[PDB]
Amino acid sequence: RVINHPYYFPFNGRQAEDYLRSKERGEFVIRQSSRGDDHLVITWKLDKDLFQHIDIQELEKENPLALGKVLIVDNQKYNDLDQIIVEYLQNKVRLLNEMTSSEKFKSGTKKDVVKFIEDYSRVNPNKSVYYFSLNHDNPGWFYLMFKINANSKLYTWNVKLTNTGYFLVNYNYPSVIQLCNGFKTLLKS
């Protein structure tokens, strides 16, 4: 389709992912959408085998092929692609890295992480434990799994990576630390 931007390709979801497979986390691609004249997608790599597709809705188009003068992502208004790449995408890549580097984050699949948490709990029978994992079935979400003690169920709450923090329940926390406190506070109540 008709768009002049270094990072634009006429790719579908699969071709985008193939193109990004071998590239760094945060590497992205803008591409046409199958939803019409007025949508684009940012595909990007969170990890090996893990890609998110962000819907870009265009408004105020001057003709069918041209890019829209107004762009909505995740209910936020933007003026051009560069603004989206920097103030939305790159902020998400920032927070992702912030989180995967935390002591509190466990890599790998959910099945694996649950194993890890349940062993730990058993060797720390009275310590409450909680870890973060990547949600491979819902790209851009983390699991938050905790276990009050060795005799409590393993509970799982969901946490959305946004461009301004980690959304949990009803609040968007701007850092991992703020998120950790916020979680310990949701429990006590």
Side-chain angles (χ1 to χ4, degrees):
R1 163 185 170 190
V2 178
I3 287 181
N4 284 291
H5 191 301
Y7 290 90
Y8 174 80
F9 303 76
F11 280 162
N12 60 47
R14 182 209 331 108
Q15 299 172 319
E17 283 170 12
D18 296 349
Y19 180 97
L20 286 306
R21 266 176 220 305
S22 57
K23 298 209 160 56
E24 276 306 308
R25 159 186 310 186
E27 294 271 70
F28 71 84
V29 140
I30 307 160
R31 68 188 182 81
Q32 58 186 315
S33 162
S34 69
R35 301 177 54 177
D37 285 326
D38 59 349
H39 286 264
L40 297 170
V41 187
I42 310 276
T43 306
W44 67 287
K45 183 176 211 197
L46 291 80
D47 219 326
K48 309 304 181 313
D49 285 4
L50 190 50
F51 306 95
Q52 158 150 88
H53 302 264
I54 303 163
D55 175 63
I56 304 178
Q57 158 90 64
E58 330 171 32
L59 294 171
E60 311 295 4
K61 291 168 59 99
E62 284 176 303
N63 65 64
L65 300 168
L67 182 65
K69 294 330 196 154
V70 176
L71 307 184
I72 320 290
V73 177
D74 180 32
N75 274 319
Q76 302 163 65
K77 181 191 161 159
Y78 299 88
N79 305 316
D80 51 76
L81 298 170
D82 282 339
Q83 201 197 359
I84 298 173
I85 291 165
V86 167
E87 280 169 12
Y88 181 87
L89 179 55
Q90 187 51 35
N91 261 310
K92 272 200 171 188
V93 178
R94 174 183 68 93
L95 296 156
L96 179 56
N97 282 321
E98 176 173 318
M99 164 70 84
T100 47
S101 66
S102 276
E103 42 159 345
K104 278 289 151 190
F105 175 82
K106 282 312 190 190
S107 33
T109 60
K110 191 193 158 87
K111 168 176 76 186
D112 291 337
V113 179
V114 165
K115 258 178 47 178
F116 169 88
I117 294 172
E118 261 158 11
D119 293 318
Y120 190 79
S121 184
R122 216 181 180 202
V123 300
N124 295 95
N126 293 307
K127 180 174 177 179
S128 63
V129 47
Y130 75 106
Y131 287 90
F132 293 104
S133 167
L134 276 167
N135 184 331
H136 296 82
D137 265 308
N138 203 347
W141 283 78
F142 307 102
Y143 295 112
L144 166 50
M145 302 147 284
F146 57 111
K147 204 180 174 186
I148 300 165
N149 51 42
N151 188 60
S152 151
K153 306 198 298 181
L154 172 56
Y155 287 112
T156 293
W157 292 1
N158 310 289
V159 168
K160 191 176 170 205
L161 174 62
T162 77
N163 68 292
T164 86
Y166 313 86
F167 185 85
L168 166 55
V169 171
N170 68 337
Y171 187 99
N172 198 306
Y173 299 88
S175 68
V176 171
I177 293 181
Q178 289 214 36
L179 176 57
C180 286
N181 298 328
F183 162 61
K184 297 180 182 179
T185 300
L186 292 171
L187 281 181
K188 286 195 166 185
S189 53

